[PDB]
Structure 1
Amino acid sequence: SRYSPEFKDPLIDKEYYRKEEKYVRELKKTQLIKAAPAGKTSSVFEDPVISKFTNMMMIGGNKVLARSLMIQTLEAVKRKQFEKYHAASAEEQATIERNPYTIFHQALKNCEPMIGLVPILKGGRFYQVPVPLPDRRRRFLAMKWMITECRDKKHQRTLMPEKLSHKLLEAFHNQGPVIKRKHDLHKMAEANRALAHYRWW
């Protein structure tokens, strides 16, 4: 739109920058380039997972508050894991994992379902049919489902940082409302199996 079609997006991995590969590098050097965005940075303390998480939880363009709340939740999970470590015996501490980043990644990739339901038109009735979903679709769905099950009017009093920290610690090993409704989605697929033939794509 704004940027001319000649411009392309650059990559970020300085480890990939610093050293046919040289042929494509020469082609990129000949080609033009636009300005990098403000969100992404080549620092080691960042990843597209938390980038998308911030961009999703943010409302009204309050990225500062979104990221402050994200780091508050990371701290909450870290302190919970540290109390687990301090209370647990040596053999159980050897098993307990404390990294909140890996905890979040595990919870997300356990909540992610590999199949979804698509509404398909038949006659005058729309029917749900199982369909395999792409990776980005599954990631977005899992993230939004986690966030929407975290924030809810049922816990209007208690605060979203600790709420979603507890929800993440629950889903870390396939527990919580997200996990239970994922199982229910799998059950709905098992119910709507035979309608698979309705899809043409």
Structure 2
Amino acid sequence: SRYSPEFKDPLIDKEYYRKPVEELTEEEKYVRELKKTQLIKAAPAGKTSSVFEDPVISKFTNMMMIGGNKVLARSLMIQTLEAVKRKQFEKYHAASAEEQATIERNPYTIFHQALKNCEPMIGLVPILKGGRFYQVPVPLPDRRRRFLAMKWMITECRDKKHQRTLMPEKLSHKLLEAFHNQGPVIKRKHDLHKMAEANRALAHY
């Protein structure tokens, strides 16, 4: 890294700075006087203080990026969010006053809940025993569960089964499926859990 270990990561949070002094604790008062003597890394081009900043969608965009083409990756993302919103406005206008209350039209709420429905609680590890391989179940950390939900969704949309369908239509269709606990990605979660139940007797390895 071109940053010496002395450089600290920047904290981009407007609220963190406007917080009054009186509310601060003696520990939080020390952290603030300390950072005034520390070197701070330049803020990356990715994240800003904008009110529309979403770290989860920004991460999903990077996991879709091919060969540093962020413009294309982000274009696909915003086209998916627009395709999700238009599909829900079409379902909303076609519904009755009672069903309309249950129809979600916010694509960020759908995107977040769609991924949370795909996160696998437990996973498997390929372990070797006596020249023979047997998988072992293990709890998954929070980072790993969130990463696997985004990798399974992107992998499913890149599958060759989809013929000539553009990515914003594929991803929007899969997100709305997972939002309703349906789809291939939800099945992958269920299969991983079901396999991790058939290997419970192998938890001692």
* TM-score w.r.t. length of structure 2: 0.94
Deviates more, 1:109-118 or 1:10-19: 10-19
After the TM superposition, which parts of structure 1 deviate over 2 Å for at least 4 consecutive aligned residues? none
For 1:139 and 1:182, the matched residues in 2 are separated by: 12
Q: Gaps spanning 5+ residues in structure 1: where? A: none
Residues 82-112 of structure 1, C-alpha deviations (whole Å, 9 max, x = no match): 0111111111111111100000100100100
For 1:110 and 1:11, the matched residues in 2 are separated by: 30
**Offset, 1:135:** 0.8
What is the aligned partner in structure 1 of residue 188 from structure 2?
181
Match of 1:21 among 6, 21, 28: 28
For 1:143 and 1:46, the matched residues in 2 are separated by: 18
**Offset, 1:150:** 1.4
**Offset, 1:167:** 0.6
Is the partner of 2:8 in helix, strand or coil? coil
For 1:155 and 1:34, the matched residues in 2 are separated by: 43
Do the aligned partners of 2:121 and 2:193 also contact (CA within 8 Å) in 1?
no
**Offset, 1:34:** 1.5
Residues 150-180 of structure 1, C-alpha deviations (whole Å, 9 max, x = no match): 1211112121211111111000021000111
Residues 21-75 of structure 1, C-alpha deviations (whole Å, 9 max, x = no match): 1111001111111211000111011121011111100001010111011000100
For 2:97 and 2:50, the matched residues in 1 are separated by: 34
| Higher percent of residues as helix | 1
Residues 110-150 of structure 1, C-alpha deviations (whole Å, 9 max, x = no match): 10011100112211112111101111111111101011111
Deviates more, 1:92-101 or 1:156-165: 156-165
Q: Gaps spanning 5+ residues in structure 2: where? A: 20-26
For 2:37 and 2:167, the matched residues in 1 are separated by: 49
For 2:86 and 2:39, the matched residues in 1 are separated by: 47
* TM-score w.r.t. length of structure 1: 0.96
Do the aligned partners of 2:124 and 2:137 also contact (CA within 8 Å) in 1?
yes
Is the partner of 1:3 in helix, strand or coil? coil
Residue 154 (1) aligns with residue 161 (2)? yes
Is the partner of 1:106 in helix, strand or coil? helix
For 2:157 and 2:114, the matched residues in 1 are separated by: 13
Do the aligned partners of 2:136 and 2:203 also contact (CA within 8 Å) in 1?
yes
Do the aligned partners of 2:84 and 2:172 also contact (CA within 8 Å) in 1?
yes
